[PDB]
């Protein structure tokens, strides 16, 4: 029973993802986050091996929560009459990357390189586990400020990864690719790479490049901060209008701008402590 295993603290946030509380597992005082999702609000459903009908978000989290990774891991979950409750890891101290960029402004390229590298490794892990997040953005990335490690959250818009076309989408429109805007069609990996280009611009310029549909489909990336030529090239490559012109994850991580990445501990000591 959920009520006796966890002590519930303050609300951390609420929105399309449900309501999330700070918590502590009474068994070992382990810090957790406690996410409540209303059953009426669950779009896609899935099945566990046991055949239990659960939100898709639980299926996806289970697929990516084995072993260590840059994903906030699902530790347990419960069904209630009108909702599901998810028990998630809670690193401490933590700040999401949206708030971090708001407070710090455009990030030094060394710091953006370290963050972006870790996001790539986490997204690779998801895809290797058969999971497409479909809502990569700074808001859905937590920074462990002491360890210098980034963690993906909020798989509520995600899907099982497939090689055929997607025609549904409930992620963030300003991170969505022009083929979705124009045709309501996209493929998983190339749409993910588009959102990663948006994210990288966001890091190095201090905000996302596009706010309107016309800008998303227009194909013009104006740089509002000084950004190195190598970094601009990688961003513009990720934001190629034609999906097949975008880099693979391998090509991103082999890009000249991505070389000589800092370790997480170095990232924390230089930029976060």
């Amino acid at each position: 029973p959920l009520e006796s295993q966890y002590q519930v603290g303050p609300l951390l946030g609420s929105g399309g993802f449900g309501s999330v509380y700070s918590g502590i597992r009474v068994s070992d005082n382990l810090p957790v986050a406690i996410k409540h999702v209303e059953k009426d609000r669950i779009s896609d459903w899935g099945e566990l091996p046991n055949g239990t009908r659960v939100p898709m978000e639980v299926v996806l989290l289970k697929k990516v929560s084995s072993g260590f990774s840059g994903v906030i891991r699902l530790l347990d979950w419960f069904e209630r009459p009108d909702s599901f409750v998810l028990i998630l890891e809670r690193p401490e101290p933590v700040q999401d990357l949206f708030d971090f960029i708001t407070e710090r402004g455009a990030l030094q390229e060394e710091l953006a390189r370290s963050f972006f590298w870790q996001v790539l490794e986490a997204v690779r892990h998801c895809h290797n586990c058969g999971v497409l997040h479909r809502d990569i953005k700074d808001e859905n990335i937590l920074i462990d400020l002491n360890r210098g490690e980034l963690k993906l959250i909020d798989f509520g818009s995600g899907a099982l990864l497939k090689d055929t076309v997607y025609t549904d989408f409930d992620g963030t429109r300003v991170y969505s690719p022009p083929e979705w805007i124009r045709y309501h069609r996209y493929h998983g990996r190339s749409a993910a790479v588009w959102s990663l280009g948006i994210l990288l611009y966001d890091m190095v310029c201090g905000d996302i490049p596009f706010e309107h549909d016309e800008e998303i489909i227009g194909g013009q990336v104006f740089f509002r901060q000084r950004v190195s030529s190598e970094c601009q090239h990688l961003i513009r490559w990720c934001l190629a209008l034609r999906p097949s012109d975008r880099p693979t994850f391998e090509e991103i991580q082999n890009h000249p701008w991505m070389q000589d990445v800092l370790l997480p501990q170095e990232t924390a000591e230089i930029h976060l402590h």
Partner: peptide, 9 residues
Amino acid sequence: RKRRRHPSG
């Protein structure tokens, strides 16, 4: 200029 969050889900 105004930086803002963008809801999803």
